[PDB]
Every structure is written in C-alpha cells, then in structure tokens.
Ligand binder design. Structure first.
Ligand SMILES: N[C@@H](CCC(=O)N[C@@H](CS)C(=O)NCC(=O)O)C(=O)O
Length: 205
C-alpha cells in the first residue's frame, strides 16, 4: 500500500528483468563470436540476399553479422545442435526471407530495448509510479513475445519429428503449417516493434 514500497518493488522487478535480459544478450553475442564456419548448419543464411545485392546474410559484413546475431537472439534457447535440423525444415518455407526477416526483427527490437535499459538498470528511480509500471509491463511483454517465438520454433522440431498433421510425410501440409507459423510469428514481431517504441518513449534517461 505505501507508495515507497510499491515504487521500490517495481525498481526490484525491473532490475531483475533487465539483468535476466542482459544474460540473454551476453548469450547470443557469444553465439556469434563462436559461430563456426558453417553457421551451425543454418544454410538458409546463404540463400538470403540484401535488397539489391549479391551479398548474403551468410557473408562477413557488419550488417550480415548483425542479421545473424539478431537471428540467434530469437533462436537463442534452442539447442545449438538442433539448428541444422531447424534449417532443414524451414528451407521448405515459402516465405523464408520474410520469416528470417522477422527473426532478425525480434532480435533487434529486443536488443535495442536491453541496450537502452541495461545502462540505466540501477537508476530508474527518476520515473513516477504510473510510467514505471508501463515500463515494466511493456518490457516483460517484449521478453514474452520473443520467448514465445522460441517455443514455437522449438515445438516445430518435435511436431515435424513426430509427423504431426503429416508435416513430415506430406510437403503440402508442411508448407501451409509453415505459412501459418510465419503469420503467428509476424504478429509477434509487429507487436514487438510497438513495445520497443513504447519503452524508448517513456524512459528517455
Ligand atoms: N527484410 C529483411 C530483414 C529486415 C529486418 O526486419 N530485420 C532486421 C534485423 S535482422 C534488419 O534488417 N536489420 C539489419 C539492418 O537493419 O541493417 C529480410 O526480409 O530478411
């Protein structure tokens, strides 16, 4: 009830969300630094081209390296040794450029929100209870959009291995499944853009 305790509970929660989210970032940065030659078997990177170029997302450029890093943010919880199998399923996606586009976007949107908040994680007390709450619910939701995307792609590995809905034995069903997945993830991506923006809006600091 007394506002000091409310305010401080919120500074506690933001503190913990911000460090948990920083651990995730230290982890996908490290996933890039230790990326082997074959990019964990994600051969789809080679098939994805910048806008009017022969440069792929597999090449050794800053923008290419960042695209794969943000993709590894989104895929961060999947076991590294399953990414080859994940890429084999997705190669069959009719919208893999767009799909991978959204992986990059969730990663980047995420990365921007934590890069903005990490340096301020101990000095959020200048905000007022209303828009400290909005900050916390916004960021926690952002973490959530990206987590769900990770769960969805993890689940696809098991469903495909199980032949669920005949996804393994029927290519047409695999395709519409993958298409539906891309719509789901695309919403999560749009929704993640709004929340990075909300967050940047109310935490100038
Ligand atoms: N449209 C690109 C992806 C664009 C996108 O939304 N992703 C972000 C992060 S991976 C991005 O392009 N960042 C690279 C940049 O902004 O230079 C695609 O279709 O594959």
């Amino acid at each position: 009830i007394p506002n000091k305790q409310i305010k401080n509970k919120l500074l506690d929660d933001l503190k913990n969300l911000i460090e948990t989210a920083n651990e995730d970032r230290k982890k996908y940065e490290k996933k890039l630094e230790e990326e082997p030659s074959n990019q964990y078997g994600i051969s789809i990177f080679k098939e994805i081209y910048w806008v009017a170029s022969y440069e792929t997302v597999a090449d050794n450029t800053d923008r290419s390296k960042n695209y794969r890093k943000f993709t590894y943010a989104t895929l961060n919880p999947i076991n590294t040794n399953k990414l080859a199998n994940l890429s084999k399923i997705l190669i069959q996606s009719k919208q893999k450029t767009l799909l991978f586009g959204t992986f990059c976007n969730l990663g980047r949107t995420f990365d921007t929100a934590i890069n903005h908040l990490y340096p301020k994680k101990d000095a959020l007390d200048k905000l007022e209870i209303s828009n400290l709450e909005k900050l916390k619910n916004s960021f926690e939701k952002l973490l959530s959009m990206k987590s769900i995307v990770s769960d969805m792609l993890n689940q696809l590995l098991l469903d495909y291995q199980d032949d669920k809905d005949s996804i393994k034995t029927d290519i047409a069903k695999l395709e519409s499944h993958l298409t539906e997945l891309y719509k789901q993830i695309e919403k999560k991506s749009s929704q993640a853009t709004k929340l990075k923006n909300n967050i940047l809006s109310i935490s100038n600091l």
